[PDB]
């Protein structure tokens, strides 16, 4: 099934929203298949934000996330990428609707607690950069009968 | 007052969302007047889709429902039908907004945990087929003073 | 498996604790098999509190629970009677520990929101008086694998 | 920083939504700087509701809020006025989105639990009438580092 | 009715536990009658902690709380003092039971987020020092019918 | 600081309690420094329950564990080992107090969702076997000021 990369940014971990964010994804009926905590290299981040290497404020971004703690995740399930983005909200937490992670907990775009994959093509690249194949664990979700067809 | 028929489908009870769903409805200021758990008779469940039978997936539903457990409910209150549908969300939980039951908990249209009446006319018919008159309990809501006129 | 009778008293319904209470039982890994809302006849209650006819304030108690709404339930699972009593707390919500329903939500013994069966013998009697056998619904709990054995 | 006046109306306090409301504002990353409980005097309420003097039922509006309890607050933070409005929802809780206070808890515009300032200019006026400058407490929010720039 | 003085200490406000704490007290069926945010002046703090004068570290005590923000409260209800203490927990959050504020949120006796009055006599003293009589608001709790006799 | 090894067992992941468990630990003021999801090897698993060889149920737990997914964790903080145990509850979820993970979610000792280290000595051994040194992430907890000295 469709996989997406969801990463709790440093400010997410600092504010103690790790549990809350996971709970939100679990309750949706989604499948956690990989999770790790790491202080990301400025070189792992260089490749994750290759798409956004084309942004004016970049020299501030990479050093930032590299410092603070990060909880990297992969979640699996039908229309994973879009629904994760839906659960997260818009980029700007001010224009982001209530009910979303960013719309319930964030104020500024520089500190939006979470990253979600923008497209399925973006997701598959992001997963490979952040995780080893061995890391992605295969398990049968007992509940999938009552979430899916 | 306006009454609507809300029914937690099998997948709802299996995932343990009975309490959460009810709490959502209670906190909105609505009045629970009837609740029951039953395995719906294929026969008596047949009339629930009597209006929509002209659909490709009809035989599969009257199977996954009748076998699994169901919590049938009637809730009362101002604009009950529309608000119930609001609380539930769209048919497809992908297009359904966050904050709603289906937008918080569901992924696939085949397993969207809950039913809500689509109109007042549809509600009155659905109440009649699922519940006996004696079943609908009459009680004075003490809090209605502070929710209504 | 072991069954117990749990009944949300009228003050429970009035305060909108129906959802919350159920949620607590659901999260424990317990199995809801019967649920009904009714205004209990003074005769149904006359027998439910027959063992408790050994109390000074009895003529005032049956009239009370008779008036307001009541949500009657049966829950199934290993050590259901004891654990339900555990989840509920002591009779007196003042001496009842925090974490319990009565210790989180109640102040007075006259208004303690919920009833739980005191013993397995008392439970089987209580279930028979409040429910018909047809009411008790048989369903396979998918998650039982990961709660039991 | 931008300040807004948020006031839980009497029906909010009645329904025990004070904690819940505050939690919602806390979790958004906002800064409570003043809070007080009062039974608002005609004097304050006439100035607070000066714009609504051109309405048939005004003598009773300044008399309802004058009766019940009210929790007056000031919250501080980036885009405070608009975000507060967003967290609260539309005036009519029927058209207000789910996820909001009014869309989660309210049914009628007469009883919508909370007030939020409509503009920055409205806010500064509202704060001055409800609170004394001494009441606005200055404190360093430790977490503002991780919510703001 | 019985009144107690409950004060969220600065670390409670810092960690965004104001709403959470209030909700806990609301849900218990208790009556908030006064609330105020202040940076406690040396005068108040010397009188609140008058019994801790014969202790080595007293000047740093009154200077910690005189720094950070504090939410002062009065709550009313049957056995208010004891149950407040019960909801709060033991002084040391390590020996305090789970379910309590201190046992759910705290680790160190120096930072245990909340104060609760230890006796009725202590409470009436504490209320007088922190609040003016005008500040204690009188209101009829609609729900007290269903919490009390 | 004191470190402990906390592991959500298969049944925990299946029932979707990962988020909730984590939140419980975060809200206590504890610091997550390592997290990973894996299907545990026989070789890795056997040394974990090495001391529990002289026990009747030794082979069968390795069956229902290795197959299922597990979320291994390391948490750091004052009195981490005992508090983790406190947060978890007793071995048997029948005798385990309400408020605890096992007392809120579990029924049988075979499926009690989580493991916690029994002593500091047992913790440091468990961390070593489950995680590499590189895996334990070093980060400054901004909120530690307000939870500790």
Automatic annotation (TrEMBL), chains A, B, C, D, E, F:
One of its GO terms (molecular function) is magnesium ion binding. SUPFAM superfamilies: Nucleoside diphosphate kinase, NDK. GO terms for biological process: CTP biosynthetic process; GTP biosynthetic process; UTP biosynthetic process. Its cofactor is Mg(2+). The active site is at 115 (pros-phosphohistidine intermediate). It catalyses: a 2'-deoxyribonucleoside 5'-diphosphate + ATP = a 2'-deoxyribonucleoside 5'-triphosphate + ADP. ATP binds at residues 9, 57, 85, 91, 102, 112. InterPro entries: NDK-like_dom, NDK-like_dom_sf, Nucleoside_diP_kinase, Nucleoside_diP_kinase_AS. Keywords: ATP-binding, Kinase, Nucleotide-binding, Transferase. SMART domains: NDK (SM00562). PROSITE patterns: NDPK (PS00469), NDPK_LIKE (PS51374). It holds the Pfam family NDK. CDD domains: NDPk_I. Belongs to the NDK family. HAMAP family: NDP_kinase. This is Nucleoside diphosphate kinase. It comes from Plasmodium falciparum (isolate 3D7).
């Amino acid at each position: 099934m469709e996989k997406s990369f969801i990463m709790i940014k440093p400010d997410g971990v600092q504010r103690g929203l790790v549990g809350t964010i996971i709970k939100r994804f679990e309750k949706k009926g989604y499948k956690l298949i990989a999770i790790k905590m790491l202080n990301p290299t400025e070189e792992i981040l260089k490749e994750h934000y290759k798409e956004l290497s084309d942004q004016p404020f970049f020299k501030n971004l990479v050093a930032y996330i590299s410092k603070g703690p990060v909880v990297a995740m992969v979640w699996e399930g039908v229309d994973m990428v879009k629904q994760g983005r839906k659960l997260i909200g818009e980029t700007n937490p001010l224009t982001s609707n209530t009910g979303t992670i960013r719309g319930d907990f964030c104020l500024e775009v520089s500190k939006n607690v979470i990253h979600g994959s923008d497209s399925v093509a973006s997701a598959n690249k992001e997963i490979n950069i952040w995780f080893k194949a061995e890391e992605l664990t295969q398990w049968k979700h007992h509940m999938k009968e009552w979430i899916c067809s």
